Amino acid sequence: AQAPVSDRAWALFRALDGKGLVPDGYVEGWKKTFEEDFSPRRGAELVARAWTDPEFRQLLLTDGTAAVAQYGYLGPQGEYIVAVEDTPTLKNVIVCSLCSCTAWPILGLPPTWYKSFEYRARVVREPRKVLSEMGTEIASDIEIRVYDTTAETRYMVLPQRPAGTEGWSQEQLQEIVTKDCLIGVAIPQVPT
Amino acid sequence: MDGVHDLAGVQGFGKVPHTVNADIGPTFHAEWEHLPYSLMFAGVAELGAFSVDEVRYVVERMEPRHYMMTPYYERYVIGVATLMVEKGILTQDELESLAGGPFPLSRPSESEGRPAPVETTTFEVGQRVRVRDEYVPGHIRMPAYCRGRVGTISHRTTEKWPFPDAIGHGRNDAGEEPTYHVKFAAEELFGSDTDGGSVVVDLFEGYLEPAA
Ligand SMILES: [C-]#[N+]C1CCCCC1
Ligand SMILES: [Fe+3]
Ligand SMILES: [Mg+2]
Ligand SMILES: [Mg+2]
Ligand SMILES: [Mg+2]
Ligand SMILES: [Mg+2]
Numbered sequence: 171a172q173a174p175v176s177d178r179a180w181a182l183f184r185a186l187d188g189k190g191l192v193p194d195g196y197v198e199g200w201k202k203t204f205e206e207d208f209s210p211r212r213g214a215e216l217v218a219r220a221w222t223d224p225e226f227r228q229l230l231l232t233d234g235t236a237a238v239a240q241y242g243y244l245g246p247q248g249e250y251i252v253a254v255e256d257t258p259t260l261k262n263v264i265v266c267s268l269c270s271c272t273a274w275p276i277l278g279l280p281p282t283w284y285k286s287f288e289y290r291a292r293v294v295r296e297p298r299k300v301l302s303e304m305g306t307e308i309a310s311d312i313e314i315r316v317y318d319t320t321a322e323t324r325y326m327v328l329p330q331r332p333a334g335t336e337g338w339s340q341e342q343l344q345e346i347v348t349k350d351c352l353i354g355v356a357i358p359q360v361p362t
Numbered sequence: 363m364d365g366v367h368d369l370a371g372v373q374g375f376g377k378v379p380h381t382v383n384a385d386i387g388p389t390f391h392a393e394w395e396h397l398p399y400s401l402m403f404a405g406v407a408e409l410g411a412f413s414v415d416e417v418r419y420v421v422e423r424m425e426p427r428h429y430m431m432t433p434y435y436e437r438y439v440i441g442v443a444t445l446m447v448e449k450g451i452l453t454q455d456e457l458e459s460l461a462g463g464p465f466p467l468s469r470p471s472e473s474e475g476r477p478a479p480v481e482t483t484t485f486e487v488g489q490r491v492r493v494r495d496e497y498v499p500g501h502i503r504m505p506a507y508c509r510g511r512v513g514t515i516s517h518r519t520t521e522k523w524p525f526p527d528a529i530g531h532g533r534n535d536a537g538e539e540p541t542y543h544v545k546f547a548a549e550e551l552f553g554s555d556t557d558g559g560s561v562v563v564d565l566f567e568g569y570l571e572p573a574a
């Protein structure tokens with residue numbers, strides 16, 4: 171038996187706040203960071219830069235942390251970054267099977283589905299079926315590699331650049347790199 | 363800790379509740395949902411009452427049925443509240459008084475944790491390693507699917523962090539270790555019963571030993 175979760179969550183806040191343990195504007199500040207600053211639009215920007223700038227691509231793949239720092243996008247749950255490169259024969263996918271670990275600043279906070287027991291249990295053992303069910307078909311000639319976020323490395327996928335985007339601006343490319351592309355469950359799509 | 367949270371490889375779950383690029387809605391679906399993470403950070407960064415690792419472990423310590431029926435953000439409300447009580451900052455009585463009803467917490471720890479191992483090996487990219495065939499009742503960042511399994515190092519971190527099995531219990535002997543991206547063939551982990559290619563696990567040095 172449990173009190174409503176909202177009542178429990180606000181009780182925790184009020185118990186701490188009432189003892190002077192929570193600075194003024196503290197939880198409000200974090201809410202703003204979580205909602206407005208941490209964003210997959212940041213990851214999309216990094217991908218679009220890598221796609222158009224071979225020098226940055228090399229930096230991103232060899233020292234992810236330095237590359238992300240150049241944009242100012244290091245942060246909580248995103249202090250040590252590794253970007254993983256999709257190739258014509260390799261598809262990368264990220265999970266935290268033990269909880270929800272995610273590169274918050276550049277991917278945004280994880281979505282409900284990523285933290286689901288279904289995703290946490292299944293993607294490590296049957297990623298091809300999971301992606302298929304989610305709408306992404308990976309051919310048998312492509313190795314699927316699942317990165318389980320079990321320590322402090324925080325990952326982003328650098329997906330393949332789709333044909334039909336030749337010459338696009340970085341802004342145009344950013345638009346097709348979605349949160350799901352960064353996690354690795356989706357492949358960037360050229361709009362009709 | 364071989365708890366129900368160690369879900370990788372468990373069979374019988376249905377479909378992932380998502381199709382690619384579907385609307386996931388706002389970051390927070392209720393007005394309280396930012397509280398668990400924010401108050402985590404108050405505990406970790408402002409009060410220095412506990413580590414992030416202790417938050418993972420306290421969530422692992424939810425009674426197993428309680429863990430399985432509790433939504434994600436609620437687990438962290440329960441976890442952070444439990445730590446505040448365990449550390450002597452809050453009482454359960456005051457939480458329940460303010461909540462206007464029951465506020466059951468995670469179960470007490472049944473392990474004091476363990477120190478960072480004194481004897482470890484610096485491994486190099488390309489080297490074959492085995493995950494130590496060890497059983498740890500407290501916090502550990504080794505999912506059971508890789509226990510005793512063999513893989514190849516694809517990365518040694520250029521930074522070092524406290525050993526989770528120690529800092530997850532608030533111990534003074536967590537030291538610092540790098541971690542290693544260890545690539546396992548899918549068949550090494552799940553035999554013939556997998557459709558994948560490889561799985562890369564990010565493993566602390568203290569979890570590893572030379573292979574062969
Ligand atoms: C995974 N996970 C949650 C608990 C540890 C910090 C990041 C959020
Ligand atoms: Fe996690
Ligand atoms: Mg106030
Ligand atoms: Mg730190
Ligand atoms: Mg199966
Ligand atoms: Mg143009």
Ligand SMILES: [Mg+2]
Nearest residue numbers: 175431432433
């Ligand atoms: Mg409920």
Ligand SMILES: [Mg+2]
Nearest residue numbers: 454455458464
């Ligand atoms: Mg009682």
